[PDB]
Design a protein around this nucleic acid. Structure first.
Ligand SMILES: [Mg+2]
Length: 758
RNA sequence: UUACUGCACAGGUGACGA
DNA sequence: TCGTCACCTGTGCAGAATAAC
């Protein structure tokens, strides 16, 4: 019935007396906050400076003496609450402001976990994992039209390596190549320094340096990355350190699992409620009841969308609630019409892996048999094909080759394809040592580039994957198979939809930011994905091939007007039919581009039809989480009383935060991985205020459905494919643009229907 | 680069205003 | 060209046999 938040009501005064000055130049703000510090809280907003006296005593300030009512303009006290919260907890130092973020004072989980696993070492004490809390004052709407201010509590972990580098070398750890950051960060300065090349002195030489190429061991520390944690801890504890890691894992679950997260939030609120918070020398705020999402009173703030249906035919008849159960039963959605029932697949691999590749190939095509029910039938039978012909392309290359692997792959491919006929896809096997080389010598991107130029999509695979034990291999081959079929132009499945309106187009934009290393400046690229309403089905449209970030707003416009025009011809809209267009991205569009897009789409479809348009952003990293106390979770393992997903809301729960925003739960207990998996964070779905379509509950459920549309895997994706696919297109095309002999000519010819980006 | 999930660190960035 | 609110993207590691069943 009810969903509990991680936030607390804040009781504020109805009203606060203020002094206002017009200050059209906001540069002035800096100095004025200083001149009046301590006596005045100061705030700029729409051309005016607002002054809230906090302590008696000059300096005095001029301006109009206006009252500000909290119900009408809650931004004022919300901002003041950022500062007030810090001052209410003066024993807890801010490591970050707005939101106020601070460290637990006693608990330190590496010590705790070493003790708990029975481990010790003289440098452990310099490895620290400390709980970090943030208190975020946010405006929300308990019912439509009335605003309130809540305080939302979030929990993470500071990882830090405070050990001096002299010790870590002397203890047996190769520092070479690790990233190094400033111990003491310079006022609004960069922290990262570079990577350690060597040490011959108290100063260390750097490569991939951000500043000067030298700094003192006492100005520098390792960054608190996991990489540096495991590299350092394996080379001081191993191979026993895995016992530490899971011990550490056990400790953090003590702050992040549902019940334990709910408890820490409760205790934070009890602490914050003990006194009143001092907004000013005689005005008080009071932290109150835990905020809830419910349908009690006049509130209609929680709902549960129905389960998504994976659908495998166009009459609606062949549906399932899980993609893979649906695929095995029915075979793929487009099986009746699928054109090429005998595909020829190039398989490019190091000659010395031959036997391993043949067994992976045999399992993929013909299956693993009934002892491995995850992948019994194999690709040909799973997808309803006649057969699959493999064209073997061994490459005489060794994992130690670091400079010429790519040219050897590309020469082998070229010489093999010149005799042979047409191949319809390829499989490229990569050595793990080659997978992450720089792109100028990386065989993943060069073989991808060569084969895409020729109109051949590829499914690549790293040797550690080819060698997976059978219990995992079966799942690997489910995803491998779904993406290969899609790259052969197949459609594995759709998700259900009942059209209220005569046509619905969703288009999404994604971003990728590319650089050779953490020093070089990242270059932005974009991708565009389209999805169409069908008869009971969401259908994946075509996909961008141009990827430059400069001008992306015009590219959104062209793809929409072009698709609308084509949809009108196909479907032959009647006078009075309603067309709906939805846009998806991880960031909001500018108002001016919304206006430009509405205008062009409105003109394109013309006056015979009604057009509805909605502009949506999907956020993952916000201060909101949802707790379902009625949820006991699931049994994790055999002989395991321990549970997973305890308090996790169900997949499809949609909570109202305000008029334009919903919280969307995607990871149910069924999908949560492990007993120690944190309480999941829901997606935040936000509607652009200039949208002409306003039903964000519907848009929240549409985004949910689009997570189930991913053909990269049998399991749902963490964001709708409108965005996800586009990010994958953007990164690929971005990388390919710099590869010699890359050409996009075939992306709209041979690859027009290929899901080559999966 | 089979993926899902999680976390960490780093870089910063976006939208709205005058 | 600043204030203010907000959180995005890249990378690397690991999974109480990781894989909705
Ligand atoms: Mg892929």
């Amino acid at each position: 019935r009810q969903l509990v938040s991680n936030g607390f009501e804040v009781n504020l005064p109805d009203q606060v007396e203020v002094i206002v000055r017009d200050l059209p130049d906001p540069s002035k703000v800096k100095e004025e906050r200083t001149r009046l510090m301590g006596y005045w809280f100061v705030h700029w907003f729409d051309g005016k400076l607002f002054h809230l006296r906090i302590k008696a005593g000059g300096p005095n300030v001029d301006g109009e003496h206006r009252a500000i009512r909290t119900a009408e303009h809650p931004w004022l006290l919300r901002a003041r609450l950022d500062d007030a919260l810090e001052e209410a907890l003066p024993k807890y130092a801010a490591v970050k402001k707005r939101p106020f973020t601070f460290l637990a004072q006693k608990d330190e989980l590496i010590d705790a976990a070493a003790t708990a696993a029975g481990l010790s070492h003289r440098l452990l004490n310099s490895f620290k994992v400390i709980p970090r809390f943030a208190l975020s004052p946010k405006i929300y709407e308990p019912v439509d039209g009335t605003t309130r201010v809540g305080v939302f509590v979030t929990i993470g972990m500071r990882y830090d390596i405070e050990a001096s580098l002299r010790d870590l070398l002397e203890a047996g750890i190769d520092l070479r190549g690790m990233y190094v950051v400033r111990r003491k960060r310079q006022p609004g300065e960069r922290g990262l320094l570079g990577r350690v090349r060597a040490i011959s002195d108290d100063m260390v030489q750097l490569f991939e340096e951000t500043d000067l190429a030298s700094v003192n061991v006492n100005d520098a520390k390792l960054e608190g990355s996991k990489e540096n944690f495991t590299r350092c801890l394996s080379a001081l504890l191993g191979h026993n350190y895995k016992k530490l890691l899971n011990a550490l894992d056990d400790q953090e679950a003590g702050y992040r699992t549902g019940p334990r997260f709910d408890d820490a939030v409760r205790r934070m609120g009890e602490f914050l409620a003990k006194k009143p918070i001092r907004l000013a020398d005689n005005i008080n705020a009071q932290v109150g009841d835990r905020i809830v999402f419910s349908n009690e009173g006049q509130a209609r703030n929680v709902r549960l969308a129905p389960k998504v249906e994976y659908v495998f035919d166009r009459t609606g008849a062949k549906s399932a609630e899980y993609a893979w159960r649906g695929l095995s039963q029915f075979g793929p959605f487009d099986r009746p019409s699928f054109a090429n029932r005998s595909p020829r697949i190039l398989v490019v691999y190091p000659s010395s892996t031959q036997g391993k590749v043949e067994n992976f190939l045999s399992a993929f095509r013909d299956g693993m048999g009934s002892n491995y029910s995850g992948f019994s039938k194999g690709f040909v039978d799973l997808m309803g094909l006649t057969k699959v012909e493999f064209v073997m392309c061994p490459v005489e290359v060794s994992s130690a080759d670091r400079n010429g692997a790519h040219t050897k792959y590309n020469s082998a491919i070229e010489d093999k394809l010149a005799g042979a006929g047409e191949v319809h896809a390829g499989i490229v096997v990569l050595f793990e040592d080659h997978a992450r080389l720089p792109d100028d010598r990386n065989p993943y991107i060069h073989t991808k580039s060569l084969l895409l130029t020729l109109g051949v999509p590829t499914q690549q695979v790293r040797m550690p994957t080819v060698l997976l034990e059978p219990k995992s291999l079966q799942y690997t081959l489910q995803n491998f198979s779904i993406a290969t079929y899609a790259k052969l132009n197949g459609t594995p499945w759709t998700v259900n939809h009942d059209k209220a309106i005569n046509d619905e187009l969703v288009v999404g934009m994604g971003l990728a930011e590319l650089s050779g290393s953490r020093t070089e400046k990242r270059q932005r690229f974009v991708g565009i994905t389209t999805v169409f309403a069908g008869d009971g089905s969401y259908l994946l449209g075509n996909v961008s091939k141009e990827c430059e970030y400069e001008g992306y707003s015009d590219a959104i416009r062209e793809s929409m007007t072009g698709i609308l025009r084509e949809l009108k011809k196909r479907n032959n809209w009647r006078p009075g039919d309603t067309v709906r267009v939805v846009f998806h991205a991880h960031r909001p569009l500018k108002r001016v581009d919304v206006a430009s897009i509405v205008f062009e789409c409105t003109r394109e479809i013309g006056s015979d039809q009604n057009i509805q348009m909605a502009f949506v952003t999907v956020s993952h990293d916000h201060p909101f989480v949802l707790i379902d106390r009625s949820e006991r979770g699931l049994e994790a393992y055999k002989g395991s009383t321990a549970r997973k997903g305890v308090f996790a809301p169900p997949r499809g729960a949609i909570s109202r935060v305000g008029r334009l925003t919903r919280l969307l739960a995607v990871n149910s207990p069924q999908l949560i991985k492990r007993a120690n998996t944190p309480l999941p964070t829901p997606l935040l779905v936000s509607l652009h205020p200039d949208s002409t379509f306003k039903d964000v509950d519907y848009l929240a459920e549409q985004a949910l459905k689009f997570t189930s549309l991913s053909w990269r895997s049998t399991l749902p994706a963490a964001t709708p494919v409108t965005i996800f696919y586009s990010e994958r297109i953007a990164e690929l095309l971005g990388r390919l643009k710099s590869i010699p002999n890359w050409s996009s000519a075939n992306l709209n010819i041979k690859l027009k229907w290929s899901r080559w980006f999966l």
